[PDB]
Design a protein around this motif. Structure first.
Motif, mmCIF file in Angstrom:
data_model
loop_
_atom_site.group_PDB
_atom_site.id
_atom_site.type_symbol
_atom_site.label_atom_id
_atom_site.label_comp_id
_atom_site.label_asym_id
_atom_site.label_seq_id
_atom_site.Cartn_x
_atom_site.Cartn_y
_atom_site.Cartn_z
ATOM 1 N N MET A 28 -6.197 -16.440 -8.583
ATOM 2 C CA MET A 28 -4.911 -15.952 -8.186
ATOM 3 C C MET A 28 -5.556 -14.775 -7.371
ATOM 4 O O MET A 28 -6.205 -13.934 -7.587
ATOM 5 C CB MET A 28 -4.375 -15.169 -9.204
ATOM 6 C CG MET A 28 -4.070 -15.894 -10.593
ATOM 7 S SD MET A 28 -2.823 -16.948 -10.528
ATOM 8 C CE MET A 28 -3.548 -18.145 -11.713
ATOM 9 N N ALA A 71 -11.689 -18.353 -10.640
ATOM 10 C CA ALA A 71 -11.971 -16.939 -11.457
ATOM 11 C C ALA A 71 -12.601 -17.050 -12.842
ATOM 12 O O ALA A 71 -12.230 -17.996 -13.552
ATOM 13 C CB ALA A 71 -10.578 -16.348 -11.495
ATOM 14 N N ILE A 72 -13.816 -16.438 -13.042
ATOM 15 C CA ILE A 72 -14.572 -16.479 -14.263
ATOM 16 C C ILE A 72 -14.654 -15.349 -14.813
ATOM 17 O O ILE A 72 -14.937 -14.349 -14.241
ATOM 18 C CB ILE A 72 -16.054 -16.875 -13.901
ATOM 19 C CG1 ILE A 72 -16.154 -18.248 -13.136
ATOM 20 C CG2 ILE A 72 -16.948 -17.051 -15.065
ATOM 21 C CD1 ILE A 72 -16.808 -18.419 -11.864
ATOM 22 N N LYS A 73 -14.104 -15.332 -16.196
ATOM 23 C CA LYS A 73 -13.977 -13.979 -16.987
ATOM 24 C C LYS A 73 -15.153 -14.132 -17.904
ATOM 25 O O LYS A 73 -15.121 -14.833 -18.681
ATOM 26 C CB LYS A 73 -12.944 -13.833 -17.712
ATOM 27 C CG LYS A 73 -12.638 -12.638 -18.676
ATOM 28 C CD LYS A 73 -11.434 -11.892 -18.533
ATOM 29 C CE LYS A 73 -10.387 -12.218 -19.143
ATOM 30 N NZ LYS A 73 -9.266 -11.339 -19.018
ATOM 31 N N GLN A 98 -8.040 -20.934 -12.410
ATOM 32 C CA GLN A 98 -7.542 -21.286 -11.087
ATOM 33 C C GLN A 98 -7.359 -19.590 -10.278
ATOM 34 O O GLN A 98 -7.115 -18.616 -11.249
ATOM 35 C CB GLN A 98 -6.357 -21.705 -10.654
ATOM 36 C CG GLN A 98 -6.248 -22.392 -9.385
ATOM 37 C CD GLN A 98 -4.722 -22.185 -8.756
ATOM 38 O OE1 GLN A 98 -3.731 -22.588 -9.246
ATOM 39 N NE2 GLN A 98 -4.606 -21.950 -7.267
ATOM 40 N N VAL A 141 -14.534 -9.836 -14.419
ATOM 41 C CA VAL A 141 -13.983 -11.066 -14.019
ATOM 42 C C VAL A 141 -14.304 -11.255 -12.548
ATOM 43 O O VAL A 141 -14.664 -10.313 -11.604
ATOM 44 C CB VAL A 141 -12.474 -11.301 -13.925
ATOM 45 C CG1 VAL A 141 -11.559 -10.242 -14.774
ATOM 46 C CG2 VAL A 141 -11.811 -11.280 -12.587
ATOM 47 N N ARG A 187 -3.463 -21.430 -16.530
ATOM 48 C CA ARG A 187 -4.150 -22.486 -17.136
ATOM 49 C C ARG A 187 -5.586 -22.315 -17.478
ATOM 50 O O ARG A 187 -6.421 -22.141 -16.445
ATOM 51 C CB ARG A 187 -3.963 -23.652 -16.274
ATOM 52 C CG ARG A 187 -2.725 -23.979 -15.968
ATOM 53 C CD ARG A 187 -2.558 -25.564 -15.236
ATOM 54 N NE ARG A 187 -2.694 -25.390 -13.686
ATOM 55 C CZ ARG A 187 -1.707 -25.719 -12.888
ATOM 56 N NH1 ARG A 187 -0.532 -26.521 -13.500
ATOM 57 N NH2 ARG A 187 -1.994 -25.745 -11.694
ATOM 58 N N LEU A 231 -14.708 -9.305 -9.036
ATOM 59 C CA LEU A 231 -13.114 -8.879 -8.781
ATOM 60 C C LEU A 231 -12.925 -7.357 -9.513
ATOM 61 O O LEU A 231 -12.125 -6.962 -8.824
ATOM 62 C CB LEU A 231 -12.481 -9.830 -8.874
ATOM 63 C CG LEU A 231 -12.655 -11.254 -8.330
ATOM 64 C CD1 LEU A 231 -11.586 -12.187 -8.584
ATOM 65 C CD2 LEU A 231 -12.489 -11.096 -6.635
ATOM 66 N N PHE A 238 -3.785 -15.317 -23.122
ATOM 67 C CA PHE A 238 -2.933 -15.662 -24.785
ATOM 68 C C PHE A 238 -4.150 -16.237 -25.540
ATOM 69 O O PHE A 238 -5.103 -16.748 -24.834
ATOM 70 C CB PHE A 238 -1.843 -16.880 -24.276
ATOM 71 C CG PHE A 238 -2.269 -17.719 -23.536
ATOM 72 C CD1 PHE A 238 -3.121 -18.775 -23.623
ATOM 73 C CD2 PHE A 238 -2.138 -17.669 -21.997
ATOM 74 C CE1 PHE A 238 -3.501 -19.695 -22.604
ATOM 75 C CE2 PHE A 238 -2.418 -18.494 -20.962
ATOM 76 C CZ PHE A 238 -3.038 -19.677 -21.537
HETATM 77 C C1 LIG Z 1 -5.365 -6.038 -13.932
HETATM 78 C C2 LIG Z 1 -6.478 -6.692 -14.456
HETATM 79 C C3 LIG Z 1 -6.467 -7.997 -13.485
HETATM 80 O O1 LIG Z 1 -6.550 -7.578 -12.184
HETATM 81 N N1 LIG Z 1 -6.671 -9.007 -13.936
HETATM 82 C C4 LIG Z 1 -7.117 -9.548 -15.412
HETATM 83 C C5 LIG Z 1 -7.624 -10.962 -15.478
HETATM 84 N N2 LIG Z 1 -7.974 -11.826 -15.936
HETATM 85 C C6 LIG Z 1 -8.075 -12.856 -15.388
HETATM 86 C C7 LIG Z 1 -8.834 -14.140 -15.902
HETATM 87 C C8 LIG Z 1 -9.708 -14.787 -15.147
HETATM 88 C C9 LIG Z 1 -10.424 -16.197 -15.852
HETATM 89 C C10 LIG Z 1 -10.180 -16.346 -16.877
HETATM 90 C C11 LIG Z 1 -9.047 -15.721 -17.597
HETATM 91 O O2 LIG Z 1 -8.607 -15.987 -19.255
HETATM 92 C C12 LIG Z 1 -7.864 -16.749 -19.489
HETATM 93 N N3 LIG Z 1 -7.229 -17.594 -18.506
HETATM 94 C C13 LIG Z 1 -6.330 -18.482 -19.070
HETATM 95 F F1 LIG Z 1 -6.028 -19.376 -18.005
HETATM 96 C C14 LIG Z 1 -5.937 -18.613 -20.250
HETATM 97 C C15 LIG Z 1 -6.632 -17.908 -21.126
HETATM 98 C C16 LIG Z 1 -7.465 -16.608 -20.917
HETATM 99 CL CL1 LIG Z 1 -8.432 -15.498 -22.067
HETATM 100 C C17 LIG Z 1 -8.467 -14.558 -17.088
HETATM 101 N N4 LIG Z 1 -8.005 -12.455 -14.081
HETATM 102 C C18 LIG Z 1 -7.873 -13.275 -12.917
HETATM 103 C C19 LIG Z 1 -8.418 -12.828 -11.650
HETATM 104 C C20 LIG Z 1 -8.209 -13.870 -10.471
HETATM 105 N N5 LIG Z 1 -7.681 -15.061 -10.514
HETATM 106 C C21 LIG Z 1 -7.356 -15.310 -11.942
HETATM 107 N N6 LIG Z 1 -7.497 -14.795 -12.976
HETATM 108 C C22 LIG Z 1 -7.850 -11.419 -14.016
HETATM 109 C C23 LIG Z 1 -6.986 -10.285 -13.137
#
Ligand SMILES: *CCC(=O)N1Cc2nc(-c3cccc(Oc4nc(F)ccc4Cl)c3)n(-c3ccncn3)c2C1
Length: 285
Positions: A94, A41-43, A92, A24, A77, A16, A157
């Motif tokens: 987004m 979504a995996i970061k 989840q 991510v 979450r 992504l 957070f």
């Molecule tokens: C402008 C930057 C951008 O488009 N994104 C930043 C980003 N981070 C995440 C995301 C994905 C997985 C885990 C995650 O970290 C956390 N999630 C929590 F629920 C609680 C604490 C942490 Cl550190 C962050 N995404 C993302 C993309 C798509 N779906 C969901 N999240 C983005 C998108």
């Protein structure tokens, strides 16, 4: 509370985006007991970024998962974590990405009702983190995700603590530090409170009102504290009435305790979102 994931339970499918702190991915997850495929979504954080052993990472991860109790619809979450050579955070999916890119790509389609309503949701999420006694440290338009155009959530957070930004021995953060979103007491003395989060909230609101503009564009980060001391602040966005701008201007106060509270910000922006065209002047409303 905190699900520890095996690499066998999930599959990263597409990329992504890649930030500074990691990459991510759009993925799929089949929990241990379950026989279903949840779209996640995996970061994957940049390897060797955290100065903590795998047990202390998990302790932080548990405290990140604990924010979902009792929860808030405007805070993300943490579904689970996977510890390999890298830290993998699962949440989840987004579909709209973050609000920074969203307001930039949809600049000529965003009205006063949406902007003001996003200000309420972000303040509702931040007020809940304040209730949970959690300081975010990195609130920005990039850390507000879009579930739907009318449902935004705060992500990342407890990530600063996880990456060792709350240590006296580990401060190996050169140009990664968000100086243009930090309160003066944070730039000068590394003091981070809920009131310093209000400062970053004001900057986040300004990013939305300017449709994704870079704060203090062109000014070097090394000069920001001096700019703030001289009384220089982010300019008033063209769509903002003075009522809206005064709220942002108040988040950027030198005395931390004099800044508006997230509780008060929810009320002010809710009053404004009832007659949106009175407070924001946008072409085609
Ligand atoms: C402008 C930057 C951008 O488009 N994104 C930043 C980003 N981070 C995440 C995301 C994905 C997985 C885990 C995650 O970290 C956390 N999630 C929590 F629920 C609680 C604490 C942490 Cl550190 C962050 N995404 C993302 C993309 C798509 N779906 C969901 N999240 C983005 C998108």
């Amino acid at each position: 509370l905190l699900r520890i994931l095996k690499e066998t339970e999930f599959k990263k499918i597409k990329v992504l985006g890649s930030g500074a702190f990691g990459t991510v991915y759009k993925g799929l997850w089949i929990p241990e007991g379950e026989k279903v495929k949840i779209p996640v979504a995996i970061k994957e954080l940049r390897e060797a970024t955290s100065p903590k052993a795998n047990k202390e990472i998990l302790d932080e991860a548990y405290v990140m998962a604990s924010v979902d109790n009792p929860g808030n619809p405007h805070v993300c979450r943490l579904l689970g974590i996977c510890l390999t050579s890298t830290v993998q955070l699962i949440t989840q999916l987004m579909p709209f990405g973050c609000l920074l890119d969203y307001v930039r790509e949809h600049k000529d389609n965003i009205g006063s009702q949406y902007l003001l309503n996003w200000c309420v949701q972000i303040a509702k999420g931040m007020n809940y983190l304040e209730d949970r006694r959690l300081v975010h440290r990195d609130l920005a338009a990039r850390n507000v995700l879009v579930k739907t155009p009318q449902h935004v959530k705060i992500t990342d957070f407890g990530l600063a603590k996880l990456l060792g930004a709350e240590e006296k021995e580990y401060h190996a953060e050169g140009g990664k530090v968000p100086i243009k979103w930090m309160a003066l007491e944070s730039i000068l003395h590394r003091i981070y409170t809920h009131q310093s989060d209000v400062w970053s909230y004001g900057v986040t609101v300004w990013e939305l009102m300017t449709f994704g503009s870079k704060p203090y564009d062109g000014i070097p980060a090394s000069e920001i504290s001096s700019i703030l001391e001289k009384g220089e602040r982010l300019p008033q966005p063209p769509i903002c009435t003075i009522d809206v701008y005064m709220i942002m201007r108040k988040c950027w106060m030198i005395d931390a305790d004099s800044r508006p509270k997230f509780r008060e910000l929810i009320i002010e922006f809710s009053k404004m979102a009832r007659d949106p065209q009175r407070y924001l002047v946008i072409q085609g409303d």
